[PDB]
Design a protein around this ligand. Structure first.
Ligand SMILES: O=c1ccn([C@@H]2O[C@H](COP(=O)(O)OP(=O)(O)O[C@H]3O[C@H](CO)[C@@H](O)[C@H](O)[C@H]3O)[C@@H](O)[C@H]2O)c(=O)[nH]1
Length: 344
């Protein structure tokens, strides 16, 4: 059994970006399962083989991640051409709602260098949805003409199942609330302004976001949180640990559907995980109302309660860490489920 992993829209090497980093980490966790796997990208390196140095059909299973299509680039075109020659099923890891599988064929001046068939992917596609709601996954891929099927798998748990995983340790607190991520084209501007702006608390937003991006008049604010630079993925939990609490906010289509990497990065940290009620209305993450907040007013009060009671804060950290460990205890089941998902 030979497996291949390819990032459909981003070059893969080192850990200079979320897509490239997640690809290497997914590659690593799949290898740790006792599976023979290669990462195929633009160039040969310590973690990858080039498209030009391998025969796509020598692989029994082809896993694909990150579809950047929805202005094609070298990575996208090379991936498309590679997938186009593969004669078997493609297993697409749907980890970001905005990035469903799609062919660049429809998507140009440079079109002169490529032909249709050369990029037309005819293989059936199995969408492995990180989200439990498959109707949402189907809707996101409604434009796909390929034969296609769907199945749910909590892909994002690769963080906690990695062999080197460790909970964050008690850390000196210099922040009230922290959130690490990107602006994501303002798709979450309303929630970000609700929970992170004008709270009167000491809040930090780390990652790609900048204050100048929050300019939609529909979501007014007076004072913004402090924005700091991007840091390595393997430093996110340590960064979250500088704060009393770390926030998880809702997103239409993600709500009551996706559990995101952030959930685990936050749960594993020394910061109490506070969740926007709308993101998990049934409290699947933690069956404890103390970890949920409906709006800004509730977030402020909850953070103040945590600051006033070290007992409450430590108790909640103990609870979230325990819950995280209960999931880590199911590693073998998780590994078996992934294997079944890719027909092994
Ligand atoms: O300085 C920073 C800030 C954030 N991150 C990472 O970026 C990830 C993604 O954050 P963001 O860009 O805000 O997007 P999310 O919607 O929170 O997460 C997306 O990316 C996750 C990991 O690929 C998936 O689990 C989610 O489903 C997908 O929506 C975080 O989890 C962190 O791992 C960094 O590496 N450095």
């Amino acid at each position: 059994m030979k497996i291949a992993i390819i990032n459909m829209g981003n070059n893969v090497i080192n850990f200079k970006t979320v897509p490239s980093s997640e690809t290497i980490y997914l590659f690593k966790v799949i290898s740790e399962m006792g599976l023979n796997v290669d990462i195929i990208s633009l160039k040969n390196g310590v973690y990858t083989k080039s498209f030009d140095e391998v025969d796509v059909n020598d692989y029994d299973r082809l896993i694909v991640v990150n579809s950047s299509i929805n202005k094609p680039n070298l990575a996208i075109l090379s991936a498309q051409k590679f997938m186009a020659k593969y004669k078997s099923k493609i297993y697409y890891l749907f980890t970001d709602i905005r990035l469903p599988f799609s062919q660049s064929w429809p998507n140009r001046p440079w079109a002169y260098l490529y032909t249709e068939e050369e990029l037309l992917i005819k293989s059936p596609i199995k969408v492995i949805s990180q989200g439990i709601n498959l109707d949402i996954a189907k809707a996101a891929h409604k434009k796909v003409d390929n034969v296609i099927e769907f199945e749910y798998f909590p892909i994002e748990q690769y963080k906690i199942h990695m062999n080197d995983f460790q909970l964050s340790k008690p850390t000196k607190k210099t922040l009230d609330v922290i959130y690490g991520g990107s602006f994501r084209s303002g798709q979450r501007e309303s929630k970000m302004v609700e929970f992170l702006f004008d709270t009167g608390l000491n809040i930090e937003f780390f990652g790609n976001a900048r204050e100048k991006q929050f300019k939609n008049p529909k979501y007014p604010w007076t004072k913004a949180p402090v924005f700091t630079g991007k840091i390595p993925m393997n430093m996110v939990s340590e960064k979250n640990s500088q704060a009393i609490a770390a926030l998880i906010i809702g997103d239409k289509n993600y709500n009551d559907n996706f559990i995101t990497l952030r959930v685990w990065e936050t749960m594993a940290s020394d910061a109490v995980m506070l969740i926007d009620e709308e993101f998990d209305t049934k409290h699947r993450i933690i069956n404890d109302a103390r970890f949920y907040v409906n709006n800004r007013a509730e977030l402020i009060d909850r953070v103040n309660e945590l600051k006033h009671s070290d007992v409450l804060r430590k108790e909640m950290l103990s609870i979230q860490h325990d819950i995280l460990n209960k999931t880590r205890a199911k590693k073998a089941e998780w590994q078996d489920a992934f294997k079944k998902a890719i027909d092994l």
